[PDB]
């Protein structure tokens, strides 16, 4: 839905890295290099960014009730 604030396994904060990760990918980076640059060191933290599916972008399409 929206990127979680903490990494489930260890608790490192990954909730401030999604925009930077997407920007690095758009700037012609591989996913491994982007994750290395963002400081995500262990695979528990890396999977939080690798496997994330951002549905709030789709949810923002529909108009609000008011």
């Amino acid at each position: 839905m929206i990127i979680p604030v903490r990494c489930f396994t260890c608790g490192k904060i990954v909730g401030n890295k999604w925009e930077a990760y997407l920007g690095l990918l758009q700037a012609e980076y591989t996913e491994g290099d982007a994750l290395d640059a963002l400081g995500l060191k262990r695979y528990c933290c890396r999977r939080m960014l690798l496997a994330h599916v951002d549905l709030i972008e789709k949810l923002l399409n529909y108009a609000p009730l008011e």
Binding site: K12, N16, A20, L60, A63, P64, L65
Partner: protein, 255 residues
């Protein structure tokens, strides 16, 4: 029948990381300190949310749960505060909590990111760690609105994991398997530890029957709330107060 004489050496010390080596200590003491890092170090975190208006695409419990996990800098005032169950106030007073306020509305044609930058506290020393990017809370369309009031109590990681002050506590003893505490079916497939003191050909240290685990290696990484030296000191003082209160109660019971 007496105590040990532990010694320390700090290999690396940065703003989010402390690596040190404890020596001449028992494995039980080292592991108890390791456990106290995670669980029983008091931290300030949001524990009471009242949502005035939420027209966003996430429900109120979702937003409150996200708010709870934003770390607040409790470097110096975590000792001054009192537990809300231990305070003389009715519900909340400045001596036992910190109040936050969020009020964001979107009136533009571009999606707006509500971040932890928008959380405003009354006390200037308890602010989100991304306020000297930002922790995203929710995204708003045009016309959507969010507004709430939140209170930041004091607690430790045994109660909830939002008061856990650490990110990953690496603990390791006897990097070369001289004590044979773990037995490798094939010793040469296993990568050498970072602290190994062996050559490129030998895989395991020779057996040491008359040895006990000493020289524990730590690496305490902080999640931004406390700084990684006060995490260690508060654990040594925090464990020491548990033992002292046990001794007081035993003395009453014996007499």
């Amino acid at each position: 029948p007496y105590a040990n004489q532990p010694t320390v050496r700090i290999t690396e010390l940065t703003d989010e990381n402390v690596k040190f080596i404890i020596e001449n200590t028992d494995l039980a003491v080292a592991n108890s300190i390791r456990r106290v890092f995670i669980a029983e170090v008091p931290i300030i975190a949001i524990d009471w949310v009242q949502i005035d208006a939420n027209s966003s695409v996430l429900h109120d419990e979702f937003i409150a749960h996200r708010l709870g996990l934003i770390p607040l800098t409790s470097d110096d005032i975590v000792d001054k505060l009192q537990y809300s169950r231990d305070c003389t106030c009715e519900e909340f007073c400045p001596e036992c909590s910190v109040e936050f306020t969020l009020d964001v509305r979107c009136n533009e044609d571009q999606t707006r990111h509500v971040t932890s930058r928008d959380l405003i506290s009354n006390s200037p020393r308890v602010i989100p760690v991304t306020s000297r990017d930002d922790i995203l809370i929710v995204k708003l369309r045009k016309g959507q609105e969010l507004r709430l009031r939140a209170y930041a109590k004091k607690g430790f990681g045994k109660e909830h994991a939002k008061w856990n002050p650490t990110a990953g506590v690496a603990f390791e003893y006897d990097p070369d398997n001289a004590l044979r505490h773990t037995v490798y079916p094939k010793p040469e497939e296993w990568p050498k530890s970072e602290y190994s003191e062996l050559d490129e050909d030998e895989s395991q240290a020779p057996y040491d029957p008359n040895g006990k685990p000493e020289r524990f290696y730590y690496n305490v990484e902080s999640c931004g709330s406390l700084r990684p030296e006060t995490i260690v000191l508060s654990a040594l003082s925090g464990l020491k107060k548990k033992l002292s209160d046990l001794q007081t109660q035993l003395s009453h019971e014996i007499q």
